[PDB]
């Protein structure tokens, strides 16, 4: 009565695990419900709406935003990206005090089992610090094939503290919560053969030991500016907020977007349709805070941000032609009704409109603030230049010198990335409109008109010894020209009869 299910195991609906990518399009939806995520649980990464709901609940707001995100047929995941959800302390953050926690660094299951199998006896010295320090010897691991088994043996070995295994990590937590310390890193008992060293939780061994907090803690309500934390830990590039961002915070979050090198999509109702300074969006435009993208919804449909964020970021930056605008792209939220005057106003104040054309979804971008395509492309470009330069320099295992050949290498790295982008759809060769330049007009305009980019690196000569010993190359100067995106067409037709 044996079964297939042991040699050919076939199942349904398994969520592929998601990992934080280097990819540009690992976007973020920041929520304000402490129901599932804590300050410590600052974020969580997802690749499927199903798992999103199964963690939050299909009735949750976050769930609905996840659906509206995942329904955009070009989905950020389609370009090797992930969704994340963050958390900012909207309300009184109650944090129940937990117990002291001990973790093993050594995730490797395979290497651990044989060493435990060979050792018949054991020795083990923990301190719950709740009194007598533990002296634990009678340890056998011969019958263990899996980490769960050694975990359970340890559980039966340590009083007042449950142990367990999570993903190659060994968690040891005392039963008492609040101001109880598991200081010991398993020590050594003179009464047997130790497991501590092989267990990887020695004092010398790297191990996180979060001593039990005193009592429950109440972090004060942070601001939406507390988004600083999220990028501090996830390296997202496209952020949101469940709530509407209050106007006084708008310049602050805009500056944050400009500095921390990411996008922030936000919507506004028709009230903010003006060229007035008091209107925050026009303030953004006049300030050049081009990373703070402003959107329009008469309903104030915050979900409209999702399908927006989910539609811009679908781009791979390695294929032949992939730089997309967003003029007239299919989105996953019902369009609204507008009359002409605020269509034009939205066009001239930077907002974007999801409306009806020929009874169809029609998303129109604006150029008052910088184009969505332009800002997103530039931002991914700068981040990619930074990362290609970084991994050229510290992980290539052959550190590049200040040899003029080496300086040429570091120039070629960015030149190669610029190639990747001109052969991508973001930059195209053409005349240079601007007046400011570097190096010399002739080579500058010649390269831009021919190659579409120009990288000129400062000479080692022009760098003083003071910063040479600082081990920093000269400041490379790269100049790019966007590829034109058709958004308008105007044509006039006469009738010769």
């Amino acid at each position: 009565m044996a079964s297939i299910s042991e040699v050919i195991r076939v199942s349904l609906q398994q969520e592929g695990r998601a990992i934080a990518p280097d990819n540009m399009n690992a976007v973020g939806i920041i929520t304000g419900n402490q129901g599932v995520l804590s300050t410590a649980d600052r974020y969580r990464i997802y690749r499927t709406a199903a798992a999103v709901a199964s963690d939050f609940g299909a009735s949750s707001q976050e769930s609905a935003f996840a659906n509206t995100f995942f329904d955009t047929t070009p989905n950020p995941i389609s370009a090797g990206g992930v969704l994340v959800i963050g958390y900012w302390r909207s309300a009184s953050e109650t944090v129940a005090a937990t117990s002291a926690t001990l973790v093993s660094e050594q995730t490797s299951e395979s290497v651990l089992i044989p060493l435990l199998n060979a050792i018949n006896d054991g020795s083990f010295t923990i301190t719950v610090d709740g009194g007598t320090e533990q002296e634990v010897t009678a340890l056998d691991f011969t019958g263990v094939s899996e980490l769960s088994e050694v975990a359970t043996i340890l559980n039966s070995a340590i009083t007042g503290a449950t142990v367990s295994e999570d993903n190659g990590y060994f968690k040891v937590t005392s039963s008492t919560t609040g101001a109880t310390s598991l200081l010991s890193y398993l020590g050594v008992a003179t009464s047997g053969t130790d497991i501590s060293a092989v267990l990887g939780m020695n004092s010398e061994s790297g191990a996180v030991l979060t001593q039990g907090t005193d009592q429950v803690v109440l972090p004060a309500e942070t601001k939406l500016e507390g988004i600083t934390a999220i990028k501090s830990e996830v390296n997202i590039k496209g952020a949101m907020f469940i709530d509407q961002i209050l106007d006084a915070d708008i310049p602050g979050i805009a500056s944050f977007a400009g500095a921390n090198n990411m996008l922030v999509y936000e919507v506004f109702d028709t009230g903010y349709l003006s060229k007035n300074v008091s209107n925050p969006v026009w303030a953004v435009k006049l300030a050049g805070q081009s990373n703070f993208r402003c959107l329009l919804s008469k309903s104030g449909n915050r979900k409209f941000a999702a399908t927006y964020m989910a539609r811009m970021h679908t781009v791979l930056f390695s294929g032949q032609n992939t730089a997309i605008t967003m003029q007239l792209k299919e989105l996953s939220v019902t369009a609204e009704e507008y009359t002409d005057t605020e269509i034009a106003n939205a066009k001239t104040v930077g907002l974007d409109l999801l409306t009806t054309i020929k009874n169809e979804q029609a998303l129109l971008t604006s150029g008052a603030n910088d184009f969505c395509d332009n800002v997103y492309n530039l931002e991914a470009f700068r981040d990619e230049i930074q990362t290609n330069n970084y991994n050229l320099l510290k992980t290539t295992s052959t550190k590049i010198p200040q040899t003029d050949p080496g300086m040429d290498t570091i120039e070629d790295d960015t030149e190669k990335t610029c190639e990747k982008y001109v052969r991508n759809g973001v930059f195209a060769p053409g005349t240079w409109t601007r007046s400011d330049f570097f190096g010399d007009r002739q080579q500058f305009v010649d390269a831009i008109a021919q190659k579409g980019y120009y990288v000129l690196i400062g000479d080692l000569a022009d760098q003083t010894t003071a910063e040479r010993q600082s081990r920093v190359s000269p400041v490379i100067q790269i100049a790019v020209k966007n590829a034109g995106a058709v958004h308008e067409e105007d044509i006039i037709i006469s009738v010769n009869l």
């Binding site: 050229l392 290539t396 590049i400 003029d404 050949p405 080496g406 040429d408 290498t409 070629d412 790295d413 030149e415 190669k416 190639e419 010399d440 080579q443 010649d446 390269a447 021919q450 190659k451 000129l456 000479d459």
Partner: protein
């Protein structure tokens, strides 16, 4: 015109790896395999100008030390399971009159196309591994 170069040979780097063991005596050489434009020419002052699709296709012959980091890189490229694309640049620094200009030549997707003819002698020393990476676009700019 008046002209002087730094950088004795055109410093070269493929796949972010720079060639630094170049066989002395004209190691690098770029050869245009084809024309830049073929034409058909008809009667009475009429021609047709058509730039071919093989415009920049250039073969780059590299001469490297018989067993060198450069030959190690090129060889590991040669013996890969999947032939490894080559992207990079050949360029020189040079001061025109007083102004310092840089003459660069990109090298797009390319690959091995003639293995070195591995010769070992006894009479005379010979450490001459000549690879030929032939790309498709080789645009010089300056």
């Amino acid at each position: 015109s008046v002209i002087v170069y730094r950088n004795n040979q055109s410093t070269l780097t493929l796949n972010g790896y720079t060639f630094q063991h170049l066989y002395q005596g004209a190691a690098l050489v770029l050869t245009p395999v084809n024309a830049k434009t073929a034409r058909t020419n008809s009667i009475n002052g009429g021609v047709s100008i058509s730039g071919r699709v093989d415009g920049g296709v250039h073969t780059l012959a590299i001469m490297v030390q018989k067993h060198s980091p450069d030959d190690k890189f090129l060889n590991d490229a040669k013996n890969s399971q999947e032939p490894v694309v080559f992207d990079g640049s050949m360029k020189r620094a040079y001061t025109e009159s007083g102004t310092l200009k840089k003459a660069t030549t990109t090298l797009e997707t390319g690959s091995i196309t003639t293995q070195p003819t591995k010769t070992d002698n006894n009479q005379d020393p010979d450490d001459s591994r000549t690879y030929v990476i032939e790309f498709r676009n080789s645009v010089e700019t300056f």
